[PDB]
Ligand binder design. Structure first.
Ligand SMILES: [Zn+2]
Length: 592
């Protein structure tokens, strides 16, 4: 009925904008120049112009949007009439609308309404095509004319056919002519609820969504994504279950946005004061190290550090051959607990963006892969449900021992440049897993790692170990002797250490991890103290013609100079002096 073409063309062209310089005509220009069909308009720019526009769009989106889209194309042809032949209908898409509904709680009254959803994107199918509008011609003495099949609506997955056609008004033979038929690009993805949002009970919810036209290959699995879509249902036909609607859900995606750095940040607000009161000059390093330990002390002086360190940052990114392998990967192989990671892993479950995968791997990937069948008829999905879900976070993997035979060739990649190269002919993609890996594994027979070399003990890997930075063993504890206070620590007393606040449990996370606003490039005397260590360690080995394997600093000089520099990323802004001493120590301890 009522018509907003007026407001539309009187908006895009007349809108002032950030610089108070005409925008949305300029976006239009780039669009017509680059042969792209999408118009991304901010909702806050509309609400700062016309409010009623919002309500009508967002609630009547179903019918209103395509109207506005065609109405735009008209204005676009008369800026550049040669825009024909290349595009049929440009798209109008809205970013950052007010209604953002968690995929967990979804009203059944929200079908056909415009909404936004936060979540992580896990499974994605390959690019496919479909018929947008099919053009048929009727063979008989009463027709000999052409027509489009989905009148006033759109056609479905499986295409329908005669008998009756409007032209002549009879049944008969119908030939499809691809000459006039319009086609559309197609893809399907699965948004899983965020590991944070997930209550301890039940399981993360999932939503099936459909990426159309140029939205294809916009989002890659493992991404932290916000989408804006219009929900729908198809079914046709539901089989098997049961649970629970019974409505196949359909999200037709208008827009996707991958924009963020760490948006999982639980809060800053008041807590900025508290973590800054926590950056106090006191030996904050040692106490913070005492915090992750609790409540257990065994032979941990090295490990307490290595974990504290692993939880922290240090990621230089250079456009020429990106080299990071930061976010230090540590592996503790020990006999059956023995307290193992059954405790320390649980403490490394208190952390941001933390993926705990118990055993080899869950979800039929465990690191990454492409899958068969599974909804269905032979639909091919590409899904990686483990190590690339920890992107910008820690993947705590217990029992590496059981790792899939096929996967040990994938980690060579995902632990090196932190990408996964995948070509199964379903697609060729580089998945982004920047995750730190804190690992654990059983040895071959009980506790074997005293006499036998620490290699060959962990079974599967011969090399992957080289792709770890700090690997520790769990001492059998023959010589403990210290265990009076050390054990009674918490079995009665609340108090343990001089600080005794121990940064709580959450709070230690609200700073130590949740705070990487720090980017400490080390300089000056540090640069030297590490070097004199480099030459002395090297020459110490290379002086002996016996070839003692070189002590292997050559690649490691890289990741020591990650460790230290970014070990004392612990609320130290760019400042690095004696931090070196700590790292060079534990590495000289390690190399030998
Ligand atoms: Zn006919």
């Amino acid at each position: 009925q009522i018509d907003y073409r007026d407001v539309f063309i009187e908006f895009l062209t007349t809108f002032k904008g950030n610089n108070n310089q005409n925008k949305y005509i300029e976006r239009i220009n780039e669009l017509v120049a680059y042969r792209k069909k999408s118009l991304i308009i901010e909702f806050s720019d509309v609400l700062s112009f016309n409010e009623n526009l919002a309500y009508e769009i967002i609630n009547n989106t179903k019918i209103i949007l395509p109207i506005l889209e065609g109405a735009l194309y008209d204005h676009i042809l008369q800026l550049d009439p040669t825009y024909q032949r290349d595009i049929e209908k440009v798209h109008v898409r809205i970013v950052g609308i007010p209604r953002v509904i968690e995929l967990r709680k979804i009203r059944s009254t929200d079908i056909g309404k415009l909404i936004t959803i936060d979540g992580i994107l896990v499974k994605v199918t390959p690019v496919k095509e479909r018929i947008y509008k099919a053009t048929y011609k009727h063979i008989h003495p009463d027709c000999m004319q052409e027509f489009e099949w989905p009148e006033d609506e759109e056609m479905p997955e499986v295409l329908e056919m005669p008998t009756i056609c409007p032209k002549c008004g009879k049944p008969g033979q119908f030939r499809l002519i691809p000459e006039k038929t319009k086609l559309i690009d197609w893809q399907k993805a699965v948004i899983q609820e965020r590991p944070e949002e997930v209550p301890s009970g039940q399981l993360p919810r999932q939503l099936e969504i459909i990426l159309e036209d140029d939205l294809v290959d916009s989002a890659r699995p493992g991404d932290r994504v916000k989408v804006t879509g219009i929900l729908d249902i198809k079914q046709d036909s539901p089989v098997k279950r049961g649970s629970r609607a019974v409505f196949d859900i359909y999200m037709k995606v208008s827009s996707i946005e991958v924009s963020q750095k760490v948006l999982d940040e639980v809060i800053i607000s008041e807590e900025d004061e508290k973590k800054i009161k926590d950056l106090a000059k006191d030996p904050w390093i040692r106490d913070r190290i005492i915090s992750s330990i609790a409540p257990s002390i065994y032979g941990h002086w090295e490990l307490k550090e290595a974990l504290a360190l692993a939880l922290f940052g240090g990621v230089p990114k250079v456009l020429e051959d990106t080299r990071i392998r930061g976010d230090i990967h540590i592996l503790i192989i020990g006999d059956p607990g023995t307290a193992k990671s059954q405790m320390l892993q649980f403490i490394s479950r208190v952390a941001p963006r933390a993926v705990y995968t118990t055993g080899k791997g869950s979800t039929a990937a465990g690191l990454t892969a492409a899958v068969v069948r599974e909804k269905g008829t032979g639909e091919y999905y590409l899904e990686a449900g483990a190590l690339v879900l920890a992107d910008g976070g820690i993947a705590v993997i217990d029992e590496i021992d059981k790792m899939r035979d096929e996967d040990r060739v994938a980690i060579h990649e995902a632990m090196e440049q932190q990408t996964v190269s995948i070509a199964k002919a379903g697609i060729v993609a580089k998945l982004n897993a920047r995750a730190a890996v804190i690992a654990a594994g059983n040895p071959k027979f009980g506790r074997y790692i005293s006499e036998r070399p620490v290699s060959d003990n962990i079974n599967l890997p011969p090399t992957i170990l080289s792709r770890f930075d700090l690997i520790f063993i769990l001492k059998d504890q023959p010589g403990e002797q210290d265990r009076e206070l050390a054990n009674y620590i918490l079995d009665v007393h609340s108090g343990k250490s001089t600080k005794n606040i121990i940064d709580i449990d959450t709070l230690r996370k609200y700073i130590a991890y949740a705070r990487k606003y720090v980017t400490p490039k080390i300089t000056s005397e540090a640069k030297n103290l590490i070097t004199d260590f480099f030459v002395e360690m090297r020459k110490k080995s290379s002086e002996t013609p016996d070839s003692p394997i070189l002590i292997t600093p050559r690649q490691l000089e890289a990741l020591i100079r990650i460790s230290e520099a970014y070990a004392k990323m612990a609320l130290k802004a760019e400042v690095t002096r004696e931090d070196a001493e700590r790292a060079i120590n534990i590495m000289r301890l390690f190399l030998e």
